[PDB]
Amino acid sequence: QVVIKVGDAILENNATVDITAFTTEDGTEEMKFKGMVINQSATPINVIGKITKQEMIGDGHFALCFGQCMLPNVSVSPVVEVGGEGEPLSLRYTFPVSNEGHTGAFTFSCFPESGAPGTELATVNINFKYKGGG
């Protein structure tokens, strides 16, 4: 009943989304994933969003926004009450400009307020493929 949407599409659970676009500012690159977490039930549900896996180049950092934009490298959102219109979700990955490519890789899951292991309601895997991905 809880899904992640990217662009116009509901993702299958555990989908993988590749982001290749980057913007440059002050010798630092930024790549961004954007989507929505949607609760398709008539009854609202309280969830927490977590980055459950993170793979970055050495001086990379990430920034999660879900309910609130969290500080750099903070992996857990606040509790958010989600319904049918959905809650925006974004993940920004920032890292040094390089002539060489690499892939930053993250997993985001939505959990019931509990946060109990194995209770994931929806999961997306996000690959930031910078300059070919390496």
- Technique of determination: X-ray
CATH code, 66: 2.60.40
Total residues found in the chain within this entry: 134
Integer CA distances (angstroms), 75 to 25, 51, 52, 108, 131, in order:
24, 5, 7, 9, 25
**Helix, strand, coil % in the chain, rounded to nearest 5:** 0, 60, 40
In this structure, the strands spanning 23-25 and 28-39 are antiparallel
d(CA 103, CA 34): 17
d(CA 29, CA 55): 16
Other beta carbons within 10 Å of 80: 19
Please give the tally of structural domains in the chain.
1
Read out DSSP for 73-132?
T--EEEEEEE-SS-EEEEEEEEEE--SS-EEEEEEEEEEETT--TT--SEEEEEEEEETT
41 DSSP 8-state letter: S
Q: Which domain holds residue 65?
A: 2-130
Other beta carbons within 10 Å of 8: 5
In this structure, the strands spanning 15-19 and 87-96 are unpaired
